[PDB]
Scaffold this motif. Sequence first.
Motif, PDB file in Angstrom:
ATOM      1  N   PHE A  16     -56.705 -81.221  54.513  1.00 11.68           N
ATOM      2  CA  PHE A  16     -56.602 -80.410  53.290  1.00 11.68           C
ATOM      3  C   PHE A  16     -56.888 -78.919  53.535  1.00 11.68           C
ATOM      4  CE2 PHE A  16     -57.121 -79.493  48.694  1.00 11.68           C
ATOM      5  CZ  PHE A  16     -56.054 -80.271  48.199  1.00 11.68           C
ATOM      6  N   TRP A  17     -56.054 -78.051  52.979  1.00 10.32           N
ATOM      7  CA  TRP A  17     -56.226 -76.625  53.197  1.00 10.32           C
ATOM      8  C   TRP A  17     -57.395 -76.019  52.454  1.00 10.32           C
ATOM      9  CZ3 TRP A  17     -50.984 -74.299  50.841  1.00 10.32           C
ATOM     10  CH2 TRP A  17     -50.922 -74.595  49.470  1.00 10.32           C
ATOM     11  N   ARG A  18     -57.905 -74.912  52.996  1.00 15.26           N
ATOM     12  CA  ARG A  18     -59.013 -74.182  52.385  1.00 15.26           C
ATOM     13  C   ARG A  18     -58.468 -73.430  51.165  1.00 15.26           C
ATOM     14  NH1 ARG A  18     -64.544 -74.477  54.351  1.00 15.26           N
ATOM     15  NH2 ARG A  18     -64.338 -75.582  56.368  1.00 15.26           N
ATOM     16  N   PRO A  19     -59.337 -73.143  50.181  1.00 15.34           N
ATOM     17  CA  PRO A  19     -58.934 -72.427  48.973  1.00 15.34           C
ATOM     18  C   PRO A  19     -58.219 -71.085  49.221  1.00 15.34           C
ATOM     19  CG  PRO A  19     -60.987 -73.466  48.595  1.00 15.34           C
ATOM     20  CD  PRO A  19     -60.744 -73.568  50.072  1.00 15.34           C
ATOM     21  N   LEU A  20     -58.637 -70.318  50.234  1.00 16.86           N
ATOM     22  CA  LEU A  20     -58.010 -69.020  50.529  1.00 16.86           C
ATOM     23  C   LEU A  20     -56.506 -69.174  50.728  1.00 16.86           C
ATOM     24  CD1 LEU A  20     -58.413 -65.921  50.992  1.00 16.86           C
ATOM     25  CD2 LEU A  20     -58.696 -66.446  53.412  1.00 16.86           C
ATOM     26  N   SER A  21     -56.095 -70.136  51.557  1.00 17.28           N
ATOM     27  CA  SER A  21     -54.680 -70.412  51.796  1.00 17.28           C
ATOM     28  C   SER A  21     -54.074 -71.074  50.559  1.00 17.28           C
ATOM     29  CB  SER A  21     -54.507 -71.341  52.993  1.00 17.28           C
ATOM     30  OG  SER A  21     -55.055 -70.772  54.160  1.00 17.28           O
ATOM     31  N   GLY A  22     -54.816 -71.986  49.941  1.00 19.27           N
ATOM     32  CA  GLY A  22     -54.333 -72.654  48.747  1.00 19.27           C
ATOM     33  C   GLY A  22     -53.991 -71.698  47.610  1.00 19.27           C
ATOM     34  N   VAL A  23     -54.813 -70.686  47.403  1.00 18.28           N
ATOM     35  CA  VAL A  23     -54.571 -69.717  46.364  1.00 18.28           C
ATOM     36  C   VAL A  23     -53.474 -68.705  46.750  1.00 18.28           C
ATOM     37  CG1 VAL A  23     -55.582 -67.670  45.303  1.00 18.28           C
ATOM     38  CG2 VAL A  23     -56.761 -69.892  45.166  1.00 18.28           C
ATOM     39  N   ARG A  24     -53.514 -68.196  47.978  1.00 14.40           N
ATOM     40  CA  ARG A  24     -52.504 -67.243  48.463  1.00 14.40           C
ATOM     41  C   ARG A  24     -51.099 -67.834  48.553  1.00 14.40           C
ATOM     42  NH1 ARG A  24     -53.763 -62.575  52.132  1.00 14.40           N
ATOM     43  NH2 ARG A  24     -55.592 -61.692  51.044  1.00 14.40           N
ATOM     44  N   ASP A  25     -51.011 -69.050  49.086  1.00 12.85           N
ATOM     45  CA  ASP A  25     -49.745 -69.726  49.267  1.00 12.85           C
ATOM     46  C   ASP A  25     -49.353 -70.688  48.174  1.00 12.85           C
ATOM     47  OD1 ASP A  25     -49.611 -68.255  51.683  1.00 12.85           O
ATOM     48  OD2 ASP A  25     -49.807 -70.011  52.968  1.00 12.85           O
ATOM     49  N   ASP A  26     -50.049 -70.685  47.045  1.00 12.40           N
ATOM     50  CA  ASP A  26     -49.720 -71.576  45.937  1.00 12.40           C
ATOM     51  C   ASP A  26     -48.220 -71.505  45.588  1.00 12.40           C
ATOM     52  OD1 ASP A  26     -50.397 -73.297  43.481  1.00 12.40           O
ATOM     53  OD2 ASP A  26     -49.606 -71.519  42.506  1.00 12.40           O
ATOM     54  N   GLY A  27     -47.675 -70.295  45.522  1.00  9.58           N
ATOM     55  CA  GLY A  27     -46.258 -70.155  45.225  1.00  9.58           C
ATOM     56  C   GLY A  27     -45.841 -69.983  43.776  1.00  9.58           C
ATOM     57  N   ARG A  28     -46.718 -70.270  42.816  1.00  7.73           N
ATOM     58  CA  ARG A  28     -46.369 -70.125  41.409  1.00  7.73           C
ATOM     59  C   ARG A  28     -46.955 -68.836  40.886  1.00  7.73           C
ATOM     60  NH1 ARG A  28     -49.258 -75.420  39.566  1.00  7.73           N
ATOM     61  NH2 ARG A  28     -50.715 -74.652  41.163  1.00  7.73           N
TER      62      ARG A  28
END
Length: 576
Positions: A356-368
């Motif tokens: 599972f990815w870390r929040p930093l990547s999750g938020v930056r790369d969310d895409g929406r």
Amino acid sequence: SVTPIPLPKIDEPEEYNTNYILFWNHVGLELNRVTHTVGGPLTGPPLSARALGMLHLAIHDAYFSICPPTDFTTFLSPDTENAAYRLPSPNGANDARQAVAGAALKMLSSLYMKPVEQPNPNPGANISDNAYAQLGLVLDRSVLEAPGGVDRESASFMFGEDVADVFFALLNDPRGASQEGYHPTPGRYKFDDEPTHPVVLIPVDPNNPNGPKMPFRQYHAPFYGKTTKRFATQSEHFLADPPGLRSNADETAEYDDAVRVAIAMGGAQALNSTKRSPWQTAQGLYWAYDGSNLIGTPPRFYNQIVRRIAVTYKKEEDLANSEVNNADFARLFALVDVACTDAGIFSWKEKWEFEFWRPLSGVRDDGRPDHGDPFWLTLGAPATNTNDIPFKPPFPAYPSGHATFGGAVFQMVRRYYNGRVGTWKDDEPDNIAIDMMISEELNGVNRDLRQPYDPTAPIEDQPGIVRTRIVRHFDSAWELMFENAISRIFLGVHWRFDAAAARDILIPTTTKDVYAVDNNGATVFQNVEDIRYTTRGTREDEEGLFPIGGVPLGIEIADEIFNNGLKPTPPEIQPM
């Protein structure tokens, strides 16, 4: 020969070190902080937890072999057929202090010594000679400081060495941190190099730090949890799939709200979107110990806490000459550091399974457009005593290592002291209070430097912004477990579900999977006294309900080990 590294003072009554059990624990803690300052062996949370588990297992059996216990028994037995599990016999050795010194010194020596034994084939090799040398000074110096002295000629001392040899040969995992063969696999929800430290330049020759440097991508212990030998667990442990994955890939409302909390609660100090208060900012750093110079990893802090607990609730007033205290401590530390080791094992096995990815990547790369933030920054794991910027630990997010380490360590303390300090249901809030507890992350001494760290000078003589000194008192181990866990949400390095199920820790709204937020938009948590870790989840590959996040996982590892009375993992169930 070597210029010894000047270490800062520890906030702890000097009296603690007159007890030889606490003394050796302390030496193990000094090696932890020193190895993280010099880049020596056994760095990182899982392996630094194992070093301490080993040390205390060796200490436990040397002591209890000479001073036999009533209920429990030694971890290993002398009459066992299997040679690998066969504990040496004393045969005349009657000095417990020297037996402990012998087991402690032998184990630590084996763990931190220069691997001249040929098998130093990149298991975790890239350690300079200075690193080994600095650690050797800590060891040599400890012999001289040990309360009561060390008599290497003693029979009891040699017996202890024998014990250490047995535990070392059985539990040592030289290549446990090998990264060889692993490469991230990108995609939504997947772990990959964090964007603020996409690559690091490390010297080609560690012995020559001011020479050539090469690109390096770090992936911390991807194969450890899967392959290493467990200590005292009697079964394999599993977590529910995290939201967005496998059987829970439909938990999008949970995932979405998690992204929202991540932003509001874990962003950089100055971003307009950050809603975290100054006090919550203090809670996030207090529990850090993210492998920093002069600080070390989380197992170090948890042991600093348990030392206070141990001495605070001791049965006899004399720390120096009391077998009642010596047995209480040898026992507690064995249970606690063994639970810590295994928790490091299972949290890492689940971390790399799901990736599972870390929040930093999750938020930056969310895409929406209306959900992510391609330019977000987290408060981050602190690079204390360096002039580097905060970072995201180099391993997957689910579950949190801090939460799992903490669930195990503090549930083990609770089981051990129940009926002694007060009375509680093993799954409800305890009475174990401590005060004057100071974290080295917030002690008025450590700091964020303005230039590279100078190892030949005390940090006090180095310009940087000094961390505020915050003295805490806690009312129970339940509070410690909880705060240690949510601290990672405030740093922005973990999602809420990496700690525990959001339902058990956050205040609900009428909208399902969406939680309460105050006036200024900050997340509101349940009262510690009301928190109950009951929400379970599903797994795609297995039938049944399973715990969610690190704390519930740590709680279960601790209960199992305790309920089984600190007994080796059956060899029939160890990894192939």
